[PDB]
Design a protein around this motif. Structure first.
Motif, PDB file in Angstrom:
ATOM      1  N   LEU A 212       0.878  -1.516   0.171  1.00 53.97           N
ATOM      2  CA  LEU A 212      -0.260  -0.047  -0.274  1.00 53.97           C
ATOM      3  C   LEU A 212       0.815   1.610  -0.240  1.00 53.97           C
ATOM      4  O   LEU A 212       0.676   1.988  -1.007  1.00 53.97           O
ATOM      5  N   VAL A 213       1.621   1.123   0.830  1.00 55.13           N
ATOM      6  CA  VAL A 213       2.581   2.200   1.062  1.00 55.13           C
ATOM      7  C   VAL A 213       3.702   2.811  -0.289  1.00 55.13           C
ATOM      8  O   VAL A 213       3.691   3.711  -1.053  1.00 55.13           O
ATOM      9  N   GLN A 214       4.334   1.721  -0.554  1.00 55.05           N
ATOM     10  CA  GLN A 214       4.305   1.686  -2.108  1.00 55.05           C
ATOM     11  C   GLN A 214       4.275   2.309  -3.359  1.00 55.05           C
ATOM     12  O   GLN A 214       4.251   2.728  -3.998  1.00 55.05           O
ATOM     13  N   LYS A 215       2.648   1.698  -3.378  1.00 53.41           N
ATOM     14  CA  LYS A 215       2.490   2.151  -4.235  1.00 53.41           C
ATOM     15  C   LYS A 215       1.836   3.718  -4.100  1.00 53.41           C
ATOM     16  O   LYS A 215       1.995   4.057  -4.995  1.00 53.41           O
ATOM     17  N   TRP A 216       1.497   4.368  -2.904  1.00 53.41           N
ATOM     18  CA  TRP A 216       1.188   5.522  -2.620  1.00 53.41           C
ATOM     19  C   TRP A 216       2.624   6.104  -2.752  1.00 53.41           C
ATOM     20  O   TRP A 216       2.271   7.835  -3.795  1.00 53.41           O
ATOM     21  N   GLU A 217       3.991   5.859  -3.039  1.00 47.46           N
ATOM     22  CA  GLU A 217       4.800   6.171  -2.914  1.00 47.46           C
ATOM     23  C   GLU A 217       5.329   6.436  -4.652  1.00 47.46           C
ATOM     24  O   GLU A 217       6.188   7.709  -4.830  1.00 47.46           O
ATOM     25  N   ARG A 218       4.800   5.767  -5.180  1.00 42.95           N
ATOM     26  CA  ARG A 218       5.038   5.704  -6.747  1.00 42.95           C
ATOM     27  C   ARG A 218       3.749   5.951  -7.814  1.00 42.95           C
ATOM     28  O   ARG A 218       4.040   6.446  -8.823  1.00 42.95           O
ATOM     29  N   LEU A 219       2.952   6.930  -7.006  1.00 43.10           N
ATOM     30  CA  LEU A 219       2.138   7.682  -7.670  1.00 43.10           C
ATOM     31  C   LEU A 219       3.223   8.982  -8.321  1.00 43.10           C
ATOM     32  O   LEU A 219       3.752   9.710  -7.530  1.00 43.10           O
ATOM     33  N   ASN A 220       2.673   9.595  -9.675  1.00 43.85           N
ATOM     34  CA  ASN A 220       3.359  10.703  -9.773  1.00 43.85           C
ATOM     35  C   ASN A 220       2.380  12.282  -9.754  1.00 43.85           C
ATOM     36  O   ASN A 220       1.229  12.329  -9.063  1.00 43.85           O
ATOM     37  N   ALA A 221       3.356  12.943  -8.996  1.00 41.10           N
ATOM     38  CA  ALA A 221       2.990  14.564  -8.375  1.00 41.10           C
ATOM     39  C   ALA A 221       2.226  15.112  -8.828  1.00 41.10           C
ATOM     40  O   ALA A 221       2.225  15.760 -10.223  1.00 41.10           O
ATOM     41  N   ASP A 222       0.588  14.589  -9.090  1.00 45.03           N
ATOM     42  CA  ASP A 222      -0.427  15.233  -9.538  1.00 45.03           C
ATOM     43  C   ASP A 222      -2.157  14.227  -9.886  1.00 45.03           C
ATOM     44  O   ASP A 222      -2.506  14.425  -9.851  1.00 45.03           O
ATOM     45  N   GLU A 223      -1.398  13.040  -9.406  1.00 46.26           N
ATOM     46  CA  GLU A 223      -2.231  12.045  -9.280  1.00 46.26           C
ATOM     47  C   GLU A 223      -3.100  12.118  -8.461  1.00 46.26           C
ATOM     48  O   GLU A 223      -2.339  13.184  -7.076  1.00 46.26           O
ATOM     49  N   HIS A 224      -4.087  11.834  -7.667  1.00 43.25           N
ATOM     50  CA  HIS A 224      -4.857  11.219  -6.172  1.00 43.25           C
ATOM     51  C   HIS A 224      -4.778  10.260  -6.063  1.00 43.25           C
ATOM     52  O   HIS A 224      -3.951   9.510  -6.527  1.00 43.25           O
ATOM     53  N   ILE A 225      -5.025  10.058  -4.177  1.00 41.62           N
ATOM     54  CA  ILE A 225      -5.387   9.139  -3.863  1.00 41.62           C
ATOM     55  C   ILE A 225      -7.232   8.346  -3.758  1.00 41.62           C
ATOM     56  O   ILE A 225      -8.130   9.309  -3.178  1.00 41.62           O
ATOM     57  N   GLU A 226      -7.827   7.316  -3.636  1.00 44.89           N
ATOM     58  CA  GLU A 226      -8.617   7.184  -3.694  1.00 44.89           C
ATOM     59  C   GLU A 226      -9.053   6.235  -1.818  1.00 44.89           C
ATOM     60  O   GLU A 226      -9.153   4.751  -2.311  1.00 44.89           O
ATOM     61  N   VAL A 227      -9.088   7.175  -1.334  1.00 45.41           N
ATOM     62  CA  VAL A 227      -8.514   6.332  -0.074  1.00 45.41           C
ATOM     63  C   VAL A 227      -9.990   5.010   0.398  1.00 45.41           C
ATOM     64  O   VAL A 227      -9.060   3.699   1.601  1.00 45.41           O
ATOM     65  N   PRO A 228     -11.135   5.205   0.417  1.00 44.58           N
ATOM     66  CA  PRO A 228     -12.229   3.705   0.286  1.00 44.58           C
ATOM     67  C   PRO A 228     -11.674   2.601  -0.331  1.00 44.58           C
ATOM     68  O   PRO A 228     -10.735   1.606   0.385  1.00 44.58           O
ATOM     69  N   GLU A 229     -11.452   2.819  -1.632  1.00 48.30           N
ATOM     70  CA  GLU A 229     -10.628   1.652  -2.258  1.00 48.30           C
ATOM     71  C   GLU A 229      -9.534   1.279  -2.178  1.00 48.30           C
ATOM     72  O   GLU A 229      -9.055  -0.175  -2.651  1.00 48.30           O
TER      73      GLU A 229
ATOM     74  N   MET B 283      -8.445   1.446   1.160  1.00 47.13           N
ATOM     75  CA  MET B 283      -8.825   0.948   2.149  1.00 47.13           C
ATOM     76  C   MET B 283      -9.138  -0.968   2.479  1.00 47.13           C
ATOM     77  O   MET B 283      -8.394  -1.782   2.604  1.00 47.13           O
ATOM     78  N   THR B 284     -10.096  -0.961   1.478  1.00 47.86           N
ATOM     79  CA  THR B 284     -10.849  -1.857   1.020  1.00 47.86           C
ATOM     80  C   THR B 284     -10.126  -3.292   0.240  1.00 47.86           C
ATOM     81  O   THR B 284      -9.635  -3.982   0.457  1.00 47.86           O
ATOM     82  N   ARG B 285      -8.747  -2.367  -0.744  1.00 47.59           N
ATOM     83  CA  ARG B 285      -7.759  -3.639  -1.324  1.00 47.59           C
ATOM     84  C   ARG B 285      -6.978  -4.046  -0.340  1.00 47.59           C
ATOM     85  O   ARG B 285      -6.464  -5.553   0.286  1.00 47.59           O
ATOM     86  N   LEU B 286      -6.449  -2.992   0.499  1.00 47.96           N
ATOM     87  CA  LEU B 286      -5.450  -3.571   1.547  1.00 47.96           C
ATOM     88  C   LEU B 286      -6.025  -4.422   2.410  1.00 47.96           C
ATOM     89  O   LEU B 286      -5.599  -5.628   2.682  1.00 47.96           O
ATOM     90  N   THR B 287      -7.579  -4.365   3.108  1.00 45.59           N
ATOM     91  CA  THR B 287      -8.401  -5.326   4.151  1.00 45.59           C
ATOM     92  C   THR B 287      -8.432  -7.208   3.711  1.00 45.59           C
ATOM     93  O   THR B 287      -8.398  -7.444   3.775  1.00 45.59           O
ATOM     94  N   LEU B 288      -9.356  -7.012   2.436  1.00 41.77           N
ATOM     95  CA  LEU B 288      -8.687  -8.124   1.261  1.00 41.77           C
ATOM     96  C   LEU B 288      -7.876  -8.995   1.456  1.00 41.77           C
ATOM     97  O   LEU B 288      -7.891 -10.097   1.780  1.00 41.77           O
ATOM     98  N   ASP B 289      -6.957  -8.367   0.817  1.00 40.26           N
ATOM     99  CA  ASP B 289      -5.988  -8.816   0.798  1.00 40.26           C
ATOM    100  C   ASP B 289      -5.176  -9.792   1.982  1.00 40.26           C
ATOM    101  O   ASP B 289      -4.222 -10.646   2.068  1.00 40.26           O
ATOM    102  N   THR B 290      -4.967  -8.900   3.394  1.00 39.41           N
ATOM    103  CA  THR B 290      -4.902  -8.759   4.208  1.00 39.41           C
ATOM    104  C   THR B 290      -5.686 -10.491   5.050  1.00 39.41           C
ATOM    105  O   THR B 290      -5.376 -10.893   5.078  1.00 39.41           O
ATOM    106  N   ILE B 291      -7.138 -10.287   5.377  1.00 38.45           N
ATOM    107  CA  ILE B 291      -8.031 -10.999   5.351  1.00 38.45           C
ATOM    108  C   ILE B 291      -7.220 -12.286   3.968  1.00 38.45           C
ATOM    109  O   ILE B 291      -7.750 -13.969   5.546  1.00 38.45           O
TER     110      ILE B 291
END
Ligand code: HEM
Length: 455
Positions: free
Chosen positions: A126-143, A145-153
């Motif tokens: 999750l961190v690396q995904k965010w680290e690799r975003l081009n400065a001008d792109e934003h983050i879809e928080v719920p989306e 966080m959902t990928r994060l939880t499904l994969d963790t479980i």
């Protein structure tokens, strides 16, 4: 001083049903709660429910010798695909106690040390995904966080990688799952099974169930054929035996448990993380306190189990977010025998009581007058909080078995987010709470500037 029970407006034989005929039922109920007070009777064509909102009455409803977990209509529907898993079983069903007794020690705080490395794996992605975003792109928080939880479980549950951070379209399983859940909630607000519900939906619903059953079953079969001993929950279920009966879990129940961990755990845990970030980004002084603790404690490229437990303030942030918007806003109870609530409202055997958690958390009598304010400090000394005043995880033997799992993950993840990035509410987002089985901030978008600290 027995008082008569109020009720909102009715619509003939349709009763109060139209009152919740909206995409935000729980939020409407909180509105009605404001008007009618700490308890009201909501009637449907062939169903009656009493919604509690006060700590006064709720602390009485949490008396296990008098009230027990009721499977609300929604849970009954969810039972079609979750079967007799922990979440959709009656306390008296034999498989409830069997799975409960076996799974208990595997969900303790102590057991989190064994899942930590797997939780870190998905966290770093999750961190690396965010680290690799081009400065001008934003983050879809719920989306995210959902990928994060499904994969963790998935990883902690059955050692399976859905690899959500490598795709746009989710793994078919997750698709079938969200769809089955969706349908389950739709039946709830169905005018009747042929309005809108038609053979087409029911067909789809039955197909989705097959996709879920097929994947889980196969995985369970493969594990016992290969004999693999991983640190996942599936391993514990295959090698465990109920201390009481001496019996192990059947392959079908095991499957239902796995599906239960997914449907019951992912949405709520992702919702929790979204709201906490939302409140942090809206309260700069709180964010500043949390970011400093995170930077001060998380001194290693990757968080240790011990370190996550030292994030005291971040914990307070999660609890305060849980107070304001509990992601699982309600749980039902039924009266084991006839009785009177608060020495005022008479209840008959089998009467259903629905606890409205968001309203419980806004009880000025317990929380003071600043209930709508986000102040983590109010949890500085949890022991100062009255019993049954804060119930984001349900009650008694029927409380969320995945509580320690949820909080440990949320604390790990939030700590890492606050350590590596600075968050910007570039759109001055206005809170819109989407409702499904859970609550989540619809469309919450943010922008994250990295602090260039290595992982
Ligand atoms: C922060 C997120 C979470 C919240 C707000 C939450 C909330 C709840 C609530 C209110 C209940 C009781 C429902 C009722 O009485 O009808 C519950 C039950 C349960 N939760 Fe959670 N939950 C969370 C995360 C999880 C996670 C991650 C798991 C999965 C590992 C999970 C697994 C369960 C199960 C299986 C039960 C039923 C336990 C039993 O009856 O034996 N929950 N949860």
């Amino acid at each position: 001083t027995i008082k008569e029970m109020p009720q909102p407006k009715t619509f003939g034989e349709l009763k109060n049903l139209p009152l919740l005929n909206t995409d935000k039922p729980v939020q409407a109920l909180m509105k009605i709660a404001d008007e009618l007070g700490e308890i009201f009777k909501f009637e449907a064509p062939g169903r009656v429910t009493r919604y509690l909102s006060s700590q006064r009455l709720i602390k009485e409803a949490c008396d296990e010798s008098r009230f027990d977990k009721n499977l609300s209509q929604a849970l009954k529907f969810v039972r079609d695909f979750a079967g007799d898993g922990l979440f959709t079983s009656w306390t008296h069903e034999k498989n409830w106690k069997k799975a409960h007794n076996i799974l208990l020690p595997s969900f303790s705080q102590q057991a989190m040390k064994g899942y930590h490395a797997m939780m870190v794996d998905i966290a770093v992605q999750l961190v690396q995904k965010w680290e690799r975003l081009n400065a001008d792109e934003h983050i879809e928080v719920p989306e995210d966080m959902t990928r994060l939880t499904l994969d963790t479980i998935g990883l902690c549950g059955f050692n399976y990688r859905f690899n959500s951070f490598y795709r746009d379209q989710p793994h078919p399983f997750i698709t079938s799952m969200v769809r089955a859940l969706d349908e389950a909630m739709n039946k709830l607000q169905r005018a009747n099974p042929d309005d809108p519900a038609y053979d087409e939906n029911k067909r789809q619903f039955q197909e989705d169930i097959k996709v879920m059953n097929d994947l889980v079953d196969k995985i369970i079969a493969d594990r016992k054929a290969s004999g693999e001993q991983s640190d996942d929950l599936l391993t514990h279920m295959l090698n465990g035996k109920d201390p009481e009966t001496g019996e192990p879990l059947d392959d079908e129940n095991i499957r239902y448990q796995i599906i239960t961990f997914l449907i019951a755990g992912h949405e709520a845990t992702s919702g929790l993380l979204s709201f906490a970030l939302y409140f942090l980004v809206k309260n700069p002084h709180v964010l500043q306190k949390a970011a400093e603790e995170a930077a001060r404690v998380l001194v290693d490229p990757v968080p240790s189990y011990k370190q996550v437990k030292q994030l005291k303030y971040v914990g307070m942030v999660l609890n305060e977010a849980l107070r304001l918007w509990p992601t699982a806003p309600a749980f039902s109870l039924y009266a084991k025998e006839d009785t009177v609530l608060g020495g005022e409202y008479p209840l008959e055997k089998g009467d259903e009581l629905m606890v409205l958690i968001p309203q419980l958390h806004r009880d000025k009598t317990i929380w003071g007058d600043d209930v709508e304010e986000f102040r983590p400090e109010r949890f500085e000394n949890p022991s100062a909080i009255p019993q049954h005043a804060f119930k984001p995880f349900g009650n008694g033997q029927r409380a969320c078995i995945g509580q320690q799992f949820a909080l440990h993950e949320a604390t790990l993840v939030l700590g890492m987010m606050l350590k590596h990035f600075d968050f910007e509410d570039h759109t001055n987002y206005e809170l819109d709470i989407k409702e499904t089985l859970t609550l989540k901030p619809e469309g919450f978008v943010v922008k994250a500037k990295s602090k260039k600290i290595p992982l």
